[PDB]
Design a protein around this ligand. Sequence first.
Ligand SMILES: O=S1(=O)CCN(Cc2ccco2)CC1
Length: 460
Amino acid sequence: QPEPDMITIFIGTWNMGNAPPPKKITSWFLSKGQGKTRDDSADYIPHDIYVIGTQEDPLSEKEWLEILKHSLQEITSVTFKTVAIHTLWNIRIVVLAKPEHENRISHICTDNVKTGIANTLGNKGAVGVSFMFNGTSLGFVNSHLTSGSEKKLRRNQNYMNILRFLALGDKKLSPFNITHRFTHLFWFGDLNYRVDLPTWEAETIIQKIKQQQYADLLSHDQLLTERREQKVFLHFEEEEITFAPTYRFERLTRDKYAYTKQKATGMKYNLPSWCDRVLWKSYPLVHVVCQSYGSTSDIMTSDHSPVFATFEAGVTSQFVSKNGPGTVDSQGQIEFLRCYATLKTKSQTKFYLEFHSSCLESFVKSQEGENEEGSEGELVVKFGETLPKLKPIISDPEYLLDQHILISIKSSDSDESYGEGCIALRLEATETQLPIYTPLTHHGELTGHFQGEIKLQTSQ
Ligand SMILES: O=S1(=O)CCN(Cc2ccco2)CC1
């Protein structure tokens, strides 16, 4: 039985509004309703992995797992295996996989982050799961961010706390947060960003939704505008939204948006909004294609509609050679030429690099770089031809061209990372000097850039 080089992944997010689900939820897992929907001819074809995020989930883990498994079994005639389940308060993540994948999945991790302080600590935060699928690392985050149209900056702070503090993936990748630890990272949930239009415009917004005219609403969606201004979710992707706002509905129908202020809402308006979202970030030049992104129309127990997204995702095999794992493959090498980091910092410490990759036996520390002043005020750290030659464990180009090098630039004085990025080895040529580039981030915000040239030697 050959190992796959692609899988499909289902991502669901549903804020259940503290109510039990209806008896049939299959439309969610079939990607049927409004938006980018899945073709009927695929209904019996199981996804490889199903990741279900709920918020305001009133069920026990047992109760929800039985509903999920019975749902998938009815659709596909396959009995899915539970990879992981993790709950923080009423925020939950379930990962299910086809039974044939059970011995392809390992290194399963779960964690949660509680956001806020005092008043604002006790119901918002995130849960996550990570694991390896053969040679590919996968991370999943379900977050319930702060509510309210006038709290976008709190949501952005919630995001940074979650990516800083959620402890998933390989703990040896110590300079890197979750935005660099995975081949593919999916971040979804009730992100709670709203359509920022005046309250007086509520009925006009409803009119537009009835006409399926979303453009003047999406141009005011806080998540898209905050992303465009680089305030949140830097270097993440989202499919185009072509489904109606998923919040706030009257329960038991989808015919009415319930937007007006009530004692139950703290006297806040809830204008129709795309609260419920799926975003992703994959390493450079790895295959990832969104094949559905939409909302169900027939699940009406909550004031939110469920959201689905599905993806093709490239995966690699657990490579063994005569040499690595457990030795190098002298036929292989990675050289950096003429590299420099440009940093936004005001500090004047010396800096060194760390190179991390599962194609190395362990991470590699560089010598300190040479600091110069840039023309427009910046710090330029030059490494010259001084960088250590990296010795991959396997030299086969079918393995090495699919790998990635994570880079951290660290202060000599504090050993703290001032920026993290990632370089793909999926090059146009081997034995050839080629330009490389990554932006550098720290705590998910832009801190600089790293650019230079690479020269990769494989056994071919
Ligand atoms: O780096 S990008 O692929 C990120 C997405 N966009 C920009 C964008 C549009 C809306 C919000 O942000 C193109 C460049």
